[PDB]
Every structure is written in C-alpha cells, then in structure tokens.
UniProtKB/Swiss-Prot annotation:
Changing residue 74 to V: In strain: CAST/Ei. Cadherins are calcium-dependent cell adhesion proteins. They preferentially interact with themselves in a homophilic manner in connecting cells. CDH23 is required for establishing and/or maintaining the proper organization of the stereocilia bundle of hair cells in the cochlea and the vestibule during late embryonic/early postnatal development. It is part of the functional network formed by USH1C, USH1G, CDH23 and MYO7A that mediates mechanotransduction in cochlear hair cells. Required for normal hearing. This is Cadherin-23. It comes from the Eukaryota. Three calcium ions are usually bound at the interface of each cadherin domain and rigidify the connections, imparting a strong curvature to the full-length ectodomain. It is linked to Defects in Cdh23 are the cause of waltzer (v) phenotype. Waltzer mice are characterized by deafness and vestibular dysfunction due to degeneration of the neuroepithelium within the inner ear. Glycans are attached at residues 63, 99, 178, 217, 244, 312. It is found in: Cell membrane. Residues 9-118, 119-223, 224-335 form the Cadherin domain. In adult animals relatively high levels of expression are found in testis, skeletal muscle, heart, eye and thymus, and lower expression in kidney, lung and brain. Found in the sensory hair cells of the inner ear. Interacts with USH1C and USH1G. antiparallel heterodimer with PCDH15. Isoform C1: Interacts with CAMSAP3; leading to inhibit CAMSAP3 ability to induce microtubule bundle formation.
C-alpha cells in the first residue's frame, strides 16, 4: 500500500547560476542535492520530479534524479531580471500521484557582458582662452548595464590632452591641467576618453571630446620688418611712397592701425634739427610710408622714424601695441 508521500530534504533550496551558461549547465545548488524521500516500501517509494513556475521554461528537471539544468533554445540574461532572482516550485510525485513540494530560489550570477557605452559617443565644447589651472571644461559619462565591479567605471584620457587637460577618474569631469591655454598656440583639441569597467576581463568604451578654444583678443601685433634703412633722393617729391611697414596679429579679428610715433632729424654734421614731425607720413591701414615734406640733404641728411601698430580690437591694453616698434632710418642722398 501507499501509506506515505514524497518529502524533500529541504523546504527551500538555494541555487545559483551564472548568466550566458550553455544548455545543460547544471544549477549550482548550495544546500545539498535536490532530493525527496518517500517512506513506503518498493514501487510506492520511487519519486518523479517536476519543476513549476513563472520562468520554469528556462530550465529542465531530470524527472528521476531531480537535477536541474539550463534548457537549450534559451539564453539566461541577468540584465532581463531585476531583481536577478528566480523562484520556482519543486514538486515530487509517487506512482499513486501523492506528492510533496519544495522551493527553488535561484540567484542569477553576473557576467561582465556589457560594455561601458557613451551616449552620445561624441562631445563638442567651447572653452575660453586663458583659464586658470583646474578650470572645469565639461563632464562626460558612460553607462554600463552590468553590476558590482562589472558596472563600476574608471575614466581616463587615452590620447590628445598633451599635458594640458586632466580627467577625474570617478566623476569623468575634465578640467584644465596646470598649463596655459592659448588659442594662438592651439585653436582646438581632440581628446579620446576611455571609460573602463572593473570586470575580471575588463571592458572599455571610448568617446571623442573635441575642445574648441574661444578667442580673447590678447596677442600684440608684431612687425615683420622691425628695422629698415632706406636712402632717398633729395629730389623725392611729396606723396612718394618710400617704405612699407607690415605687421601680423594672430588674434581672430584684429583692427590694426599704423602710426608715426617720432621723427628725429639730423644735420650732415650730426647736429639735431627740431620740428620735423611732418617730414614723412604713414598710411593708417596699409603701413605704407610716404615722403610728405620736400627734402634737402644740407638741411636734414638723415631721419630716424619710429612707427607703431595698435590693435583697436584689443581686449587687453597691455597687448595692444607693438613691442618692439618699427624703426625706419631714412638717409637723404644728394643730387
Ligand atoms: Ca508513497
Ligand atoms: Ca547578459
Ligand atoms: Ca551582465
Ligand atoms: Ca561591463
Ligand atoms: Ca593668447
Ligand atoms: Ca587670442
Ligand atoms: Ca591683438
């Protein structure tokens, strides 16, 4: 006769299984083997095992041994279960269909199968020139759908910083290093930033950060021909172009004006001649220098002309005028 029914060794079985485990991978069952005993003699003592519940379909149970395995056809993916926990009903039956039950609590262990990804992959940011050391430029962030160390990200810059920007490993905040940021030295930067996780086989994602340097007008105009000495015929008439000073300004929208700052005039015997500030003129826009007053060697034999260029657009008074000024020496030849 059938005087007893199956009875499991435990009431709850605590199992675990790694995600992406192949079909036939058996559950790791932490509290003894799954096992139901039936106290009858002979035929009424053998048990058949079933396995039931929402998510039973991911597994198979051996109906004779009660061992439990990943089914073929299916993929166990931790990232589709939050929490990462399955509960199932174990049912043991005997030949007269009397039965017993137990629980199967399965933890889905994490595998580092998701990359740190950046949304968006690219970053474009403007940064004004001459910023102090430590100026925060922008903050990047990567997402990683894994957990624990498999989802915890260290940021770094793989290349492009050129010892001028630094990134906070945790926050992913990029800041100016201890180094000058001069738009005249470099207009833009292209950083590659790596976000790396802490999985045993670590995974990394990367982002392009383009850093565009905005302009302050802070660079002084430079004469390209600072010293010049030219000999002019005493018969050279007013209006005659005799020389030409030219300057470059490396800022974005310079408004260069040219000026004669002094004219020092001298005798053939080297003695000074006063009130010769009208001898020559310079074009304010072109830096073209012209004879303006009629000439004579035995009145003035040489002129030292000093010239300067100012950047009207300048944002810094200190970097608005030429250093050095242009020197033009005009030696008068006899006729
Ligand atoms: Ca029985
Ligand atoms: Ca997965
Ligand atoms: Ca995972
Ligand atoms: Ca990961
Ligand atoms: Ca500058
Ligand atoms: Ca500038
Ligand atoms: Ca300038």
């Amino acid at each position: 006769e059938n005087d007893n029914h199956p009875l499991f060794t435990e009431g709850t079985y605590q199992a675990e299984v790694m995600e992406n485990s192949p079909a036939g991978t058996p559950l790791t069952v932490l509290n003894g083997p799954i096992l139901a005993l039936d106290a009858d003699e002979d035929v009424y003592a053998v048990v058949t095992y079933q396995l039931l519940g929402t998510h039973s379909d991911l597994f198979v149970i051996d109906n004779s041994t009660g061992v439990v395995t990943v089914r073929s056809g299916i993929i166990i993916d931790r990232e589709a279960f939050s929490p990462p926990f399955l509960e199932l009903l174990l049912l043991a039956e005997d030949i007269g269909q009397l039965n017993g039950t137990a629980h199967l609590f399965i933890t889905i262990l994490d595998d580092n199968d998701n990359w740190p990804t950046f949304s968006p992959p690219t970053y474009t940011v403007h940064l004004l020139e001459n910023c102090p050391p430590g100026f925060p430029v922008l903050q990047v962030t990567a997402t990683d759908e894994d957990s624990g160390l498999n989802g915890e990200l260290v940021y770094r810059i793989e290349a492009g910083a050129q010892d001028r920007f630094l990134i906070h490993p945790v926050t992913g905040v990029i800041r100016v290093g201890n180094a000058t940021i001069d738009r005249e030295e470099q207009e833009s930067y292209r950083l590659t930033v790596v976000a790396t996780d802490r999985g045993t086989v670590p995974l990394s994602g990367t982002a392009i950060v383009t850093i565009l340097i905005d302009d302050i007008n802070d660079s002084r105009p430079e004469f390209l021909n600072p010293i010049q000495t030219v000999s002019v015929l005493e018969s050279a008439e007013p209006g005659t172009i005799i020389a030409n000073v030219t300057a470059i300004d490396l800022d974005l929208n310079p408004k260069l004006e040219y000026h004669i700052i002094s004219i020092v005039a001298k005798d053939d015997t080297d003695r000074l001649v006063p009130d010769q500030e009208d001898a020559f003129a310079v074009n304010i826009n072109t830096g073209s220098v012209m004879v303006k007053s009629p000439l004579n060697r035995e009145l003035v034999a040489t002129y030292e002309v000093t010239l300067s260029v100012i950047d009207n657009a300048s944002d810094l008074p200190e970097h608005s005028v030429s250093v050095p000024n242009a020197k033009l020496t005009v030696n008068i030849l006899d006729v």
